[PDB]
Subunit: 358 residues, 4 copies
Amino acid sequence: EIPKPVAPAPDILRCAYAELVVTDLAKSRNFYVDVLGLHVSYEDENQIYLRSFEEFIHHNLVLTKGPVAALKAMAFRVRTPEDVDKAEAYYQELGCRTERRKDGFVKGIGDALRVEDPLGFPYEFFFETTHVERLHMRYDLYSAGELVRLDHFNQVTPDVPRGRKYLEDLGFRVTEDIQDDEGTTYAAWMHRKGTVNDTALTGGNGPRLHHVAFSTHEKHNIIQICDKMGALRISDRIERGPGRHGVSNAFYLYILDPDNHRIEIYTQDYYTGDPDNPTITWNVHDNQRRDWWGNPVVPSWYTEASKVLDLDGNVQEIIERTDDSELEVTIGADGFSFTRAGDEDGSYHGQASKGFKL
Amino acid sequence: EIPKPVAPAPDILRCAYAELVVTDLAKSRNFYVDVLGLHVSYEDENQIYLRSFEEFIHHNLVLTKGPVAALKAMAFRVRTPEDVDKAEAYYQELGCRTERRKDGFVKGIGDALRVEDPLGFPYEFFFETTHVERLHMRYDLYSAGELVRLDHFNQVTPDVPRGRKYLEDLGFRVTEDIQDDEGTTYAAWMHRKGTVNDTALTGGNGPRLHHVAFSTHEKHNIIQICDKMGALRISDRIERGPGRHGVSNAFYLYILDPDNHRIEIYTQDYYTGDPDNPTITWNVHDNQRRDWWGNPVVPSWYTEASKVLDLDGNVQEIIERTDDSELEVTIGADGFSFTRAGDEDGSYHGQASKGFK
Amino acid sequence: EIPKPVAPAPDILRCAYAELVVTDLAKSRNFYVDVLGLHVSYEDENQIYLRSFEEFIHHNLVLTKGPVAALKAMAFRVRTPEDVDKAEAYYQELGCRTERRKDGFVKGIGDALRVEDPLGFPYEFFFETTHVERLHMRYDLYSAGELVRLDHFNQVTPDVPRGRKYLEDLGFRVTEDIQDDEGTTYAAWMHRKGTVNDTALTGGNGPRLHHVAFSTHEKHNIIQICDKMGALRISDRIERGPGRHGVSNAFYLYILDPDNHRIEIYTQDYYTGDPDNPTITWNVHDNQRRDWWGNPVVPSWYTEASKVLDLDGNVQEIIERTDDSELEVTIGADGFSFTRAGDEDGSYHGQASKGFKLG
Amino acid sequence: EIPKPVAPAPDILRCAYAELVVTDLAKSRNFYVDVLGLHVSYEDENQIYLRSFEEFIHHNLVLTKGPVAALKAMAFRVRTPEDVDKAEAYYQELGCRTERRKDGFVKGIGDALRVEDPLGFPYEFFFETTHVERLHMRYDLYSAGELVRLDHFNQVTPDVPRGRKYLEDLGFRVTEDIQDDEGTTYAAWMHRKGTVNDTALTGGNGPRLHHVAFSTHEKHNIIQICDKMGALRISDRIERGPGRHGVSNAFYLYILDPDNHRIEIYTQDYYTGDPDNPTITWNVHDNQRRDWWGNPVVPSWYTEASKVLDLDGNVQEIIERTDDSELEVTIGADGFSFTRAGDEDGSYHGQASKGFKLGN
Ligand SMILES: O=C(O)Cc1ccc(O)c(O)c1
Ligand SMILES: O=C(O)Cc1ccc(O)c(O)c1
Ligand SMILES: [Ca+2]
Ligand SMILES: [Cl-]
Ligand SMILES: [Cl-]
Ligand SMILES: [Fe+2]
Ligand SMILES: [Fe+2]
Ligand SMILES: [Fe+2]
Ligand SMILES: [Fe+2]
């Protein structure tokens, strides 16, 4: 288990931005700007800094050209400059590698701490950021698929309980999770800002980044992204969805960028900010837990995820999950899922729902 | 080939209602009234008469208790009372069995003709119907999933060109179809009322009724139906969707009633009323023709459909399709589909899209 | 009274396009293309030809540069080439001035007949038109405010029953109307294509063109047009709405182009194609008849409308309405409206709803 | 000026519920339940306890029968039981009257403090509450107009800067405000939970309660409430909207309950939780500030608001505003409003936008 430091945890406000390494900056720009409509805060020949429609901080997404596509940092904003000091002391006590730069790692961010966290992920903590024009009423720019906020990250890690304890000590509260009747945890979601999540853990080989999620205002905005991708004849880059989530209750869609980084589009989860917010636990065999409508979860969603980098820019070695696999127990050859607990009708043995096999 | 009568075709306005035989009336009522929110026009111990939010004719759906679930009649409204006489002469010349009831077959319909049509389907033609309160501004009754109009039927039949020519003679205009390069037709959509379809032909063993479709105002109304079915823990009765259609461009969902009758929910297709409305042909291997987003079509959509009855209420014998199977050529072991024509990236060989066999 | 000809009426399919004269073509282009997102079929220094997202005929709107902003033609497509000949005979029997051009008045239209109709309006009838790429699945182009179809026209004319009868003889069927208890008709809506209207008559001094209406898919598309106009700091060009209509049950908005031509954005009216479609008559004092939510009807809606041209391009003289004014009887100083018939609560006397009088 | 106490402010989570006094409990139930679709947690002959679709605390609204319709309490939930003690000490240092009930003022709330705050408003602070079934995935119950959360309160008070400083010391952050070029503040919005507001101050005679706001998921849910009010032939109870706000950028509607308590329906404001969230100041003469589309603000919006009670249940005396009136300076006789700053075209002199004047 990861011990709880004597040192006070930093006060984390929210997920704020991700830095993604991409291999072809122009192809990535085309996806994130021309297809998805994100707004350019700054760009040059090496990097593109993008923000959502309602953001005032410098960016939500940095695309950095590099040789290997990977997550380089997932950044959380802290409440005060002094919280960056707290973050540094906290991670030093945990025995984690840290690097602090008073003028930031990327443009538009000031004093920042990056760490290789106990699960192998590159976390950044910062307060100082360059404010930009908040585009929230720029309806002259508004896309029919407009991405309005950064919502969350989702991480793949082999041991969910181990990770969950560490994030709870850091101040995240678990909102929903997935378990079985045999003591296995498959996933958990946890928050600071009072939505279902700021980061989440998905059981699997890791460290890998499962996805970065952006919000829309309404469900039709998500539909429009799918319609546009059909019109562009890139529907093969729609991985899963659209649907209603069980966990989170949000309307959702998963798409893949040119380097196969998975982006979720997400809307209309619920308020979690009360400290006794009731925690919802689903059974892993409940076929409405991921897609509420019982639509099958494609195996690539379980198996594929992005590499992550260490502070030297090198790919982190992947550690294999030894706990049961959600894929195997639900849609594999010996898998099972149900629609109604205890009802054989609407249950699936050794295959996925709605008529499909792997 | 089905010859064109010399008798003038009835002037058909639109699809108007279906009569479905159901085995358990209370269970069926629960689905159509309590789940789907259709409005009761009349009921007793034997039948439930239901209508959509914007309808003024007596009903769009009649549920009739019987021993074997099946389509008993698919009904079209005609322009004038004299068009029922035309329909009778027309089908008599075709050599079809007909039955005329001057006082109707079901409540709220007057003078009506039922026929066993040349494709084996029980069609009704009528003009006279009891007007009821049009609920189109009754927002005090409006459901988050409200079904606002009856939109179309879809029929499974073995020989699509044969059926298409028969429907064209009857005045239906083809709007869209699916074909391959060898010249096989897999499906056609055709209309009277100036939408993408009033009835449609799906290639397969028939006569069987593929579905009845109702429209909503907006796409979120369809999402709500899915969400409601999840809450009621009957998500297993969501067969396919929700999705954007390629053919028709409509947003869609397919669900199954307690007797496995398939209901489509549908919104936002386009205007087809001009006589030179451009006809759209899709290639059968195009993975965006059915679901525009490339989601796979579940095999049950191609294989399962409702029995239909003859005028004595016995189940109509089925004729097997001998033309190529859309299932087999797209998602079966020797099938294939593409995202971009001529591109192996985003193509699927011997399985369906998105990772599924 | 306008007589019914012996000659058969042409079979009219639908409203198809309007030709509007505009005074500054670049300013008008900015409005219809950059603000509203209509699609250009053809343009030059003299004209801009525009279509909606789902259209396959050549255009829904022609902007023609000229000295005096006005309606030059409201055009209906007919079912067959021969229906143009029927239109010509029909209007010649009515004693109307007609002009026939075998190769069209505007680009992308073939054989066409323009008439100065018995109410002074320039109608066009045509069958032949150049087909274009139907953009209905071009979601790479789709705007958050996308205009998907042309829906209808609305005409201001002093004597509504006189015009209604003439349109009925032409095959248009009345769907809804607005009357009072003492027999005055204020407005009527009438269709060919199976929606609430293809053209409509608003009582007032005329001939003038009240508006041209385009459809969206959903209500939020209309909300976006408002939002965008706020962002562009042209909210003063939002005239009325958005709202829910009583008559038609459609969600709506009225906006003004650079020459004050009024454009309606409209969605989700109901099917009227059955021949016994039930007609709906509203009382003029029913404050839910126009805006169903009871929001006040802005006075310019009742007073302002576009000039129309005759076949020489000169403005048609205006004839004054002598029947009662809807403005006056509902929101003027002697006006009244109700929420519930017979209830003083929720009634308005000498002013509009929601606490406003006329400015 | 209201001094900053030495005692630490309670840690406030969010607005949580209001208790409104109503004169006819059945008529009020018809409005909030049958019209608006709120969910009944408990009721009897004297009270109705209601909650929104996504709520897990016992209620968001208590309707209490009494002789005079009024706000009885606006309630904020605090982070810990100990914050109720902090609240008591804080308000005692402010010199305010307070009342502490270990088992609650209303059913489903435990240990609770009510205070007559420095602006004369009855605030409640509590932590303990009975959890109920959270209905957030009960789509079998979901209405076409479903109210999904309680969002905020809005208070009418004569001196906005005085109130603003007090609420800032209590830890609310101002997100937007309306001012003019001559030093007057007409309104301010302020939050704890990371939306545009939890409570707000509107300049006017007070203390009075301007509104309680509930949110929906989507704009069409707000359209449906209007549509249903039309079908029920109660469109006279739609006061203002629907619209897009300038302040907050939310889609909105204002409606009136049977006692004229004003309810806002609200959706799709933006995230404010960062501590340096940019404060937006609108000029009072900007005609897109309140309705972004420039629709005129109905005069009753500026003049009418609910009475509020003291801790004895008596109506609080009203103190008149002496600062300039937003109504007067925008749509009154000497009013002015603009569409584009510095452009005469689209400006309005001595009347409202869109062709309207103030009714007599
Ligand atoms: O299978 C598909 O998705 C094509 C399709 C289009 C329109 C319809 O009404 C329908 O039932 C089926
Ligand atoms: O004024 C109103 O609100 C009534 C009305 C209904 C339908 C329309 O198309 C229209 O232009 C006007
Ligand atoms: Ca001043
Ligand atoms: Cl999921
Ligand atoms: Cl406001
Ligand atoms: Fe996610
Ligand atoms: Fe269909
Ligand atoms: Fe109109
Ligand atoms: Fe408010």
